[PDB]
Subunit: 227 residues, 4 copies
């Protein structure tokens, strides 16, 4: 079990660190920044790379909504669920913790305002998208993400390619909804950075818990049911 | 059969949502938009990801030109073609629907004006290209795309890699022809967003439903015949 | 050996069409251009996609220096050499032709002047490098290209991945040279477009035959001797 | 064992020449420059391609920290450690040497003033990050990298996908840190270009030997201990 939890912690820690890291440290860098499309890749890679390395230990979740989604899909044990979620959330915090430290080594940093790569909606959305839009897009993408995970993990799917699917799947998702909610689909990755924003990010933090979980559950049931 | 239909439906939905969705949400974002290459990647990824996820169910077409292209080349049962094509068009439209709703959360959005990521040519070509150009490009790419599909699915090609190839083929295609026609090579995709543009998008819609399927068949036959 | 040459022809076409195509049409589009890196991806993506498609038919060369190289390496029969190359150069020119036609569709185009994605050195070096620099870099990336081809195809290399390895390999090479010579490392491609330039493109072309093919040999022997 | 050393040597050469190449030759370049994101992909690719190519000959380290890290993970014999490092460092220097020659071809170039893609911190950090911040990323991303390298190569991990995991993992590392330290995480890479800076680059060179090797060893101990 430990292995499983450690796998899930470093996994997520890696997700956040690389994800919000590129987000914070390189995304809008003066002239050579990696923009949204860079951050999009980054995130996916944290999952593509971590899935290979430790996926074979836990399940390569690194996401609460993926742990809960795989559950509603009949793939994951309801017993081990909670642990997995804590582990993911803990790893994420430890990540944003260092990230924050690292980000401070530069003049002008500020977790608040900058948002510390926190997710939000309306007035707190990158594009200024309505909460509703943030709801619709998060849902579809969360559902679709589990829909792809269950598919790439289905015993009839090209074995060993799963990580690539799931990985790049997250890159896709980002390329899509950054302007809306700065992309979440992961209540662990959203909590981690909110903690260090400690403002609106924490107020809307709930949103990025219910919404992703619900959608992942739909994605799971959609696969368990219609396949 | 239903699975095969649901698979193709969700698959296309993913395609229109991810591809068109990124183009209508992030491609032109201020200082961090993903640009064309951004969109190109995303598009190919919807395919690469669903190609793995549900590829092992419906064969992973998601494109009416791909299905008919396979039939032509002699790999898909003519007795199933129309079933897939419906599922796909329906899927794509559901996507365009949600995308439409989502894009409206940001003040100042206008489907018709903006183009809702529809395909066109001349006066409607992103780079303002002739129709002759739109015709040649879409044709060649469509063919090549189908040939790549046939060759990648040949019993002698590396097993399981297909999805990586076919998806990256579509990214390659979008990197080459977004300035021209905004890259279609998919009737169901073109239809979905066009409907929400109402105007000229539907006015040239036929173009991206004849040219694309023609090329797909030429490509299919190219391989079935010569290899 | 028809099937082989057919493949070797369509492939090269897809290469010159997708690479130079992306260069001339997208690359520097008003404000969403795929840029140098976009091209770089595209170029590689052509080889990655065709290797999977017809690689299982002709060995997926699509490059004179990759055939001469495989020969020097001792993987390709000297017999089938001249045949491949012919096909490779042919298919390329047919692509550059169609591209030319497509490129002329936009008001303002001009094959000469713009350069039509041809390769050159100094006065014709994208960044205006010396011929010496042009030489050294074309030499290192040719040899390296082959060493990676030979290796990724050694009976002891991860089977089925070669296409990815060689494809992304080309991308890497384009990410590096571009500013120097627009990245050749393929006598076939350099020719195709040089023809339609009809100016210096042809004048310096000789350079883009001897240098890549010499390098391709260096690499062949390199891996064939020391591994 | 000469093959293994030749393998590690060309590998690393391909690494420095490829990454530092794209870096000092393309990242900047006018309106098309590949910037950090391009440079990031590049480096990753050099590893990915060479990993498939000669990875089956030496284990594909191309990084002193990655060789010493593996050693700590109980995956590499200490006897061969010192040999590998010499190979890698020599291969790197040779790359910087030519790359130096190539960049010098363009009018107006000063390896010194330009930095020549050297790693540094504080006054020499691209984004002006403090040494503490430098220390932290470098450390984390090194232990992380080495960790991913272990899991991807675990007997229970997906066979053959390692080179994709690792190489892509390095691209990630670069997406997150370039602003900070310009991303070393490889003592052989740092050394190579420093030599041709010959000012501050060498001045801080030590830091990029101890930090990434400490990180790399911790990484492995983590996998050795917690798997
Ligand atoms: C099962 C869970 O496994 P983990 O997810 O926890 O991950 C491992 C760490 O265990 C290993 O020590 C390192 C090097 O990193 P170092 O761990 O931070 O420790 C050495 C060290 O001493 C602290 O007191 C400083 O504290 P703060 O985070 O409180 O500062 C906040 C502003 C810290 O910055 C410094 O790096 O790399 C991590 O990824
Ligand atoms: C032109 C239109 C039709 C196309 O040729 O193909 C036929 C498919 O179905 C539809 O017209 C309907 C969408 C309701 C299929 O062959
Ligand atoms: C060190 C851990 C910090 C958690 C603090 O979180 C935020 C800060 O990042 C912000 O700049 C301000 C002022 O409001 C605080 O609550
Ligand atoms: C910086 C602290 C570095 C601790 C490094 C671990 O070092 C130990 C060696 O000392 C031991 O003999 C070998 C045996 O295979 O196992 C290693 O992991
Ligand atoms: C293990 C990484 C150790 C990093 C140690 C910091 O090392 C630096 C020195 O190199 C520098 O010259 C002095 C000046 O007062 O400041 C120290 O903090």
């Amino acid at each position: 079990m430990f292995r499983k939890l450690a796998a899930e912690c470093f996994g997520t820690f890696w997700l956040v660190f690389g994800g919000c890291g590129s987000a914070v440290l390189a995304a809008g860098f003066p002239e050579l920044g990696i923009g949204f499309a860079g951050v999009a890749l980054a995130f996916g890679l944290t999952v593509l790379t971590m899935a290979f390395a430790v996926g074979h230990i836990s399940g390569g979740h690194f996401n609460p909504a993926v742990t809960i989604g795989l559950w509603a899909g009949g793939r994951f044990p309801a017993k081990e669920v909670v642990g997995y979620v804590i582990a993911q959330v803990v790893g994420g915090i430890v990540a944003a913790a260092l990230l924050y430290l690292i980000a401070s080594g530069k003049t002008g940093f500020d977790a608040a305002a900058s948002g510390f790569a926190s997710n939000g909606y309306g007035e707190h959305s990158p594009g200024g998208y309505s909460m509703l839009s943030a709801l619709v897009v998060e849902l579809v993408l969360s559902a679709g993400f589990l829909l792809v995970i269950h598919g790439a993990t289905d015993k009839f799917a090209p074995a060993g390619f799963a990580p690539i699917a799931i990985g790049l799947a997250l890159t896709l998702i980002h390329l899509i909804s950054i302007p809306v909610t700065n992309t979440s689909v992961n209540p662990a990755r959203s909590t981690a950075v909110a903690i260090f924003q400690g403002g609106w990010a924490l107020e809307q933090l709930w949103f990025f818990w219910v919404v992703p979980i619900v959608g992942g559950i739909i994605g799971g049931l959609i696969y368990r049911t219609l396949l």
